[PDB]
Amino acid sequence: STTANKERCLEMVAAWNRWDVSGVVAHWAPDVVHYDDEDKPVSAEEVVRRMNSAVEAFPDLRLDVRSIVGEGDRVMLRITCSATHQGVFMGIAPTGRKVRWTYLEELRFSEAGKVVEHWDVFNFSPLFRDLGVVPDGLKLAAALEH
Amino acid sequence: STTANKERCLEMVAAWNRWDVSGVVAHWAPDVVHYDDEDKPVSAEEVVRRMNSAVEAFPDLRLDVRSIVGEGDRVMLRITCSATHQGVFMGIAPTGRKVRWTYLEELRFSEAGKVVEHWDVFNFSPLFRDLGV
Secondary structure, X not given: OHHHHHHHHHHXXXXXXXOOHHHHHOOEEEEEEEEOOOOXXXXXXXXXXXXXXXXXXXXXXXXXXXXXXXXXXXXXXXXXXEEEOXXXXXXXOOOOOEEEEEEEEEEXXXXXXXXXXXXXEXXXXXXXXXXXXXXXXXXXXXXXXX | OHHHHHHHHHHHHHHHHOOOHHHHHOOEEEEEEEEOOOOOEEXXXXXXXXXXXXXXXXXXXXXXXXXXXXXXXXXXXXXXXXXXXXXXXXXXXXXXXXXXXXXXXXXXXXXXXXXXXXXXXXXXXXXXXXXXX
């Protein structure tokens, strides 16, 4: 149901919060499709690579569910992210800075309750309010997205 | 009444697409609260100022609802905006380029179908990086 679907989404966020990427991936159908913010398919390979890099880059990554609504087979979330940049992120040498952004997710679920479709949207206001529009903000924003 | 809230959200997007900011505001309750990223209230006037600038700077602005979900008194929508950058926007001189950005609106409605709370309210507003300057 919708209720189970929402709880599944909280479980994936719980897995992110322990820095456990395969705990997240365990919720995907094996034929899951991942999309851009603009509905273009992104390879599973690249999605996982980005997730791994985030875990290595951000030892204290925290995902704060700010809102969550479900209907039928779909769920959407608004999540505030924060972290200290202490490991390499997508080739970017660690800066030591406190970084924040807003991360927006739409998931569609199969009757069996596995993710069949996933869309990522980012809002980077919090990143540039802080880091104040520096080269660092630009490079990090560009590496967090497809 | 989930159905009706969703329908109200579609009238608001149609109003944006008519470039009619007061058509959107008309859906607000007298005592609407607008929140920014940090849950800090913003004034109706600051919001309207910004919608007015967007409509002025991106005169061919078009919003496309990619999906919409309703639960209880809440609605979220995933919207893709496209426009050409024609006017100065928040001090950014125009490029004439086709520009594109996506955001998720998040609203709560009163029982009579009026917006009473709107979160991350400046999310419709493109950043300089979405404009490539």
